[PDB]
Design a binder for this molecule. Sequence first.
Ligand code: N1E
Length: 119
Amino acid sequence: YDIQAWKKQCEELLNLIFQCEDSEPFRQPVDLLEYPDYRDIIDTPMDFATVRETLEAGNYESPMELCKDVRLIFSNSKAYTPSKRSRIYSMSLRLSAFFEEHISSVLSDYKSALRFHKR
Ligand SMILES: COC(=O)c1ccc2ncccc2c1
């Protein structure tokens, strides 16, 4: 029932994601010189460095906020890909599976702790 424990759990999950080869396209903002039409398709850019900086600044109030920004990384990849068989999109699907498998217990433990607080 620790209402604060989600933050270190999210820091350690971001560390695993940065060690994964599949995160490399997603670590920094998409390069607009490399992809000159990017902002014609994508209204809200997002990347893992932005997620980690928002967490370390104390600008997430809950793990659900962090989960919404990480899911935006993956939806941007799906919207920008020219093909469902593209290399970078394929990397996004593996990394999304890994993220969802790990964030499940973080969300469950937080929501249980808050229900206990408010009992
Ligand atoms: C041929 O596919 C691509 O070049 C591609 C596909 C997905 C992407 N996702 C994010 C950033 C860049 C991306 C690029």
